[PDB]
Design a protein around this ligand. Structure first.
Ligand SMILES: Nc1ncnc2c1ncn2[C@@H]1O[C@@H](COP(=O)(O)OP(=O)(O)NP(=O)(O)O)[C@@H](O)[C@H]1O
Ligand SMILES: Nc1ncnc2c1ncn2[C@@H]1O[C@@H](COP(=O)(O)OP(=O)(O)NP(=O)(O)O)[C@@H](O)[C@H]1O
Ligand SMILES: Nc1ccn([C@@H]2O[C@H](COP(=O)(O)OP(=O)(O)O)[C@@H](O)[C@H]2O)c(=O)n1
Ligand SMILES: Nc1ccn([C@@H]2O[C@H](COP(=O)(O)OP(=O)(O)O)[C@@H](O)[C@H]2O)c(=O)n1
Ligand SMILES: [Mg+2]
Ligand SMILES: [Mg+2]
Lengths: 659, 659
């Protein structure tokens, strides 16, 4: 396209010369040298400039589309005086070196694979890899340090320092005393969560993310037994008094099984202040219900009808798409981190399931694989297959990549460095799942698509466990590996009490893990892929298309097919805008197409949850299950929560999107 | 009155039995023992119960008026289950022991004097003396730790921990980079003071003071050269966008002489970011003007017309009564703390002039003397005189009191304890100045009242320096006494280049100070006396009456006189409400009365400033000069600032009150 050509004109070609430009950069308005490459990476480039410059293939800048490329210019490529200095290949090459340091062999391998669009790293890595303050992490899981003004304000300092750089914040607050609680040393009473949430909201608005044009935003995690619960869930509502809302933060429920049983049973639910019911957040499952029932019998709390709370939550979600729902017990029963203690929250997108404490703030580095790039016709005729062997091969590269990032990362706070060097959690993901199904001509809700889902995820989990095992053989297991499920030979699907699909040799892998350990406590956590999917030009994530339309450019695979059937007139172009990206109830479109290009609003949510359930058994962590409802009703939303809850899911619902 | 009798009924009489009740107290709704007396004070009472209980004179509860007594019940006397448990004599006795510990001799002497209304301690002391967390201080002067997110958030933690208890905050911010400034490590630009002030505003609203029904509030200090100045002064304005205001905070200008010259000269004024003009706040006077003029010649800032800024400041004050005005150079040239470094702010009421730094947060303990209590007829006939000898005697008691508080104080933060144990500053003040003049039949603007003002303050400063000297002989001088003006024999009026009035022997005192030192770096800082003056039933401070009226109860001294002239009919009662507390232009009132009961709005502000000027030469620190304007104009307000500025005043203006 024109835009790519215009870049090639207004930019230097030689990579080493672009690295010089950037590294030598000086802020003209200030006189301060503002270098955009690190000493480490600069020196690496200059001692390998012939090898490097010649490896860059500039054709590959035409691998991107208009919406893809303009994302890169608008925010990703490095700038010298507002003007763009990096080419897409330069960004990628910088990222490759930034990850691999002196391993030029690996650097070239990452480069090739990235430039060919096999995979990509999360935005923080793209921004910061190769730069002086290389903060490459997306996820921070932060413990509320203690139920005190000192505790709260230390915690608040930590969130600001973290927000100063890339990456969002999951913050759990189950230990802050609710409204009206006693405070020793004064006749004053506690004001509870809301005024304190307003303070975190304010810090959110003040500290811009990486200096970006972002929404800076935290997700907050609370257990539905907390006496401040009704207000907490209403935090994003559009009306009411401004003093009781916090519109830049996201409420998330950390829900124990007992809450759900009691709702299903139409029973009673009791609410506590954590000062009156200590320990509730530091246990789960059976131990939680022993302790909760006891406090409930001891008059320590306020009982109401479970369904009163339930109904209130369903209101908040229908209006605002929040609170998110994550099942505390499913998260804890099935974490490879359970040997560390009780997991108390997830992250900003409900995918990370990691342990966190006042002195240990969980971190995660993210990368995603492009599923469509492993499709080939490779048979004979024209029937396309999916190359699972290249997928396995590539997911071992991404695992080794993300494992290097841990060591080369700048950590905003000491709690993060302590946490990551100990457990070394890692987070692989996917994009282009819908595209894959479409290219292989499989309706999202087919028995074939169902089988492909499982196979894809079985191979990614196996690959990652294998690479991580090979890494353990080189560097030793991670510090806390002794006593872990993995050390006892218990993998993820085992914690779901299921045999794996069996496309790979799990016996040999398990044997080796028990012998040598693994480098990473966790490996898999499919994330929302918001901006990175636009860069590669794929559908987000593992969801299906939201519409076939989306200055409005129609689905490429649908368009191809409408032209092939020679029915693409103006009648199609208008009925598509009219029905906003739906092709059902169109008189002249074949049934195979209507089944293939069903929009997410037309696929059943039981099918969506089934596939989440199915693939979930190969997920160390969790995944961001977005839910979509056409004509929403209380009962309709109720049976989705309970359905996924019974399916054993960790993340029951990320966002709820409507009409 | 009825109210005092009703207390004596619903309360135990024996002091030791009230201390038992309080100390043994248990929070019924919680089960936690919530003792309201300390171990220290409880044990003292029980080992002296006969001596103590018999010393209390319960007649003295009738020393208070209706508005006085109801202040005590509403917030001062200790409560057992919402019900009042303390009598006024019990509060006083608790305070006496809380200050003096085991010195029962001193305790009894303080008690008697306090119960007789010779003097009182500031509200924090009344609340907390004798209690487990005895935070007795009113004033905190806090340095902005550094121009960083870490700096800002440490500073913010400190203000919250301080606000958790009694006492207000003076916070200086001259070192935070202004809007649009460069930040290393990001393409992001600085947002400046306002968004950061919104964060401090929020913390102000969240942390209630002592758990009170207060306005929690900080005063912020800035130098008029700061590039963020125009917005800063408008922080309390009633209109505009909510995002640019901070209605719970008070802006205060720290003004260098050069700003005023340039305004008087109709010259230019240049504005800087502290990152572009480092050091401006860490110097004053001649050194400031050498450094400022240089940066101004070096193009580092933005020049505009001084009077543009001046006019903007006068708008803000006319509408909102703020910004306060304190003259930086007068404060620094004339501080006994100049050997410590450069003073960077005052406090919440513009009276404290103390040194503060990131590791040293200035604190001050306050007490005030009741001026009317030293009036006696003691001559022969009926002509009243003022007993200066009892005043001297009493001001030595208050100095010794406030000196004990320093050692028995609970400090909210380590920076405060370091600061106070080093310099031991102290702050005496006065109330009932207007009452004194009235009782002695002296118009506020008389040559007699002028002479009384000077004499009163000469004796308080002398007394305090004397007591502090006697204390130094017992315990040694304060740590930092070597190199101080006082160590070189230079007292306050010397720094104003003036001979003292000479009612006391300054030669002998100076001799002794140079020989033995003093215990306190500073002693005198007349404060606004808002609530304490209501308790004792006197006019605030050293200002004159705001009206003769104030369910509306007329001035006692005026009423007395209107009845004595037998002219007090209903015509008087209505013309007083009609003219709201003014007696001028009333046909049947003698001229001596009209001159005596002039309202503050009728006394000339040149006279007010003259008396501030006069007395100021005996003030270690500064005083809260409230200004009052009838029909305000730009020029009218201009000549007040310049008049007081030329008079050498430190605090040019606290609040500005209008029509
Ligand atoms: N001044 C205040 N304003 C508002 N909330 C407060 C205040 N002081 C305490 N709180 C609330 O109670 C706090 C816990 O008290 P904290 O300051 O940690 O210890 P404390 O004052 O020693 N009382 P306690 O924790 O009961 O021994 C936080 O959870 C706040 O929600
Ligand atoms: N993420 C951010 N959001 C808003 N303001 C910021 C941010 N980062 C820095 N600032 C502003 O600049 C800060 C000073 O930068 P700071 O965080 O102390 O050190 P730094 O990031 O290392 N850059 P520098 O101080 O220029 O070396 C504070 O004064 C803020 O006003
Ligand atoms: N709008 C967003 C989205 C995600 N994030 C954080 O960045 C992580 C990356 O998730 P993602 O799927 O959106 O990936 P990218 O936005 O990095 O391409 C999320 O898990 C959040 O922790 C954010 O800070 N702001
Ligand atoms: N409304 C007020 C007034 C003063 N203060 C602080 O308490 C100090 C006492 O000053 P003051 O003259 O008002 O005395 P009292 O209010 O303690 O009787 C002031 O200098 C401020 O530091 C406050 O916190 N809130
Ligand atoms: Mg506490
Ligand atoms: Mg810095």
């Amino acid at each position: 396209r024109i835009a790519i050509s215009n870049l090639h004109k207004q930019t230097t070609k030689q990579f080493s010369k672009v690295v010089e430009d950037l590294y030598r950069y000086v802020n003209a308005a200030t006189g301060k040298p503002a270098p955009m490459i690190s000493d480490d990476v600069y020196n690496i480039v200059m001692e390998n400039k012939d090898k490097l410059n010649s490896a860059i293939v500039y054709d590959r800048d035409f691998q991107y589309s208009y919406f893809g490329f303009k994302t890169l210019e608008r925010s990703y490529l490095l700038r010298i005086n507002g003007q763009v200095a990096e080419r897409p290949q330069h960004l990628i090459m910088r990222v490759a070196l930034g990850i691999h340091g002196r391993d030029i062999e690996a650097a070239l391998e990452t480069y090739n694979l990235m430039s060919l669009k096999y995979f990509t790293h999360a935005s923080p890595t793209l921004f910061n890899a190769g730069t002086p303050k290389p903060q490459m992490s997306s996820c921070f899981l932060v413990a509320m340090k203690e139920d005190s003004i000192e505790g709260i304000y230390d915690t608040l300092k930590e969130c600001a320092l973290i927000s100063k750089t890339a990456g969002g914040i999951g913050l759990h607050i189950h230990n802050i005393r609710s409204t009206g609680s006693y405070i020793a040393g004064t006749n004053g009473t506690s004001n509870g969560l809301i005024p304190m949430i307003r303070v975190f909201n304010n810090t959110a608005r003040y500290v811009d993310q990486g200096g970006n044009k972002r929404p800076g935003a935290f997700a907050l995690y609370l257990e539905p037994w907390h006496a401040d619960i009704f207000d907490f869930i209403d935090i994003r509502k559009n009306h009411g008094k401004e003093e009781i809302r916090a519109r830049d933060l996201f409420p998330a429920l950390w829900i124990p099984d007992l809450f759900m049983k009691r709702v299903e049973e139409n029973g009673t639910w009791t609410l506590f202040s954590p000062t009156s019911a200590p320990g509730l957040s530091d246990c789960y499952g059976d131990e939680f219900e022993a302790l909760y029932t006891r406090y409930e019998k001891e008059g320590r709390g306020k009982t109401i009808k479970a369904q009163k709370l339930w109904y209130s939550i369903l209101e908040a979600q229908t209006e605002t798409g929040t609170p998110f729902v994550v099942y505390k017990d499913a998260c804890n029963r099935k974490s490879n981190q359970k040997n560390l203690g009780v997991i108390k929250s997830s992250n900003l997108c409900c995918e990370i399931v990691e342990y966190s404490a006042p002195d240990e703030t969980a971190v995660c580095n993210l990368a995603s694989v492009a599923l469509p790039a492993f499709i080939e016709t490779s048979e004979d005729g024209k029937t396309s297959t999916y190359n699972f062997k290249k997928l396995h091969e590539i997911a071992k590269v991404v695992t080794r990549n993300l494992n290097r990032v841990i060591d080369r990362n700048y950590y905003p706070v000491e709690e993060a460095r302590k946490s990551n060097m100990r457990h070394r959690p890692i987070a692989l993901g996917v994009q282009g799942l819908a595209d894959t199904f479409m290219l292989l001509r499989l309706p999202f809700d087919s028995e074939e698509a169902r089988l492909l889902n499982i196979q894809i995820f079985e191979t990614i989990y196996h690959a990652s466990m294998e690479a991580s095992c090979e890494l353990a053989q080189k560097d030793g297991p991670y510090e806390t590996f002794q006593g872990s499920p993995a050390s006892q030979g218990i993998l993820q699907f085992d914690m779901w009490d299921q045999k794996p699909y069996g496309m790979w040799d799990w016996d040999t892998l398990r044997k080796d893990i028990m012998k040598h350990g693994v480098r990473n406590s966790l490996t898999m956590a499919p994330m929302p892929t918001a901006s990175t999917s636009q860069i590669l030009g794929y559908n987000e994530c593992f969801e299906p298309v939201t519409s076939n339309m989306y200055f409005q450019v129609v689905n490429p695979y649908l368009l191809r097919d409408l032209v092939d059937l020679g029915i693409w007139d103006e009648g199609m172009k208008q009925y598509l805008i009219t029905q906003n990206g739906s092709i059902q109830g169109l008189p002249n479109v074949p049934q195979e197409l209507k089944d293939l290009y069903k929009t997410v609003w037309e696929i059943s949510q039981k099918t969506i949850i089934n596939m989440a359930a199915d693939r979930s058994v190969y997920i160390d962590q969790s995944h961001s299950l977005n839910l979509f409802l056409r004509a929403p009703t209380m009962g309709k939303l109720t049976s989705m929560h309970f359905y996924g809850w019974k399916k054993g899911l960790k993340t029951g619902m990320y966002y709820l999107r409507t009409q």
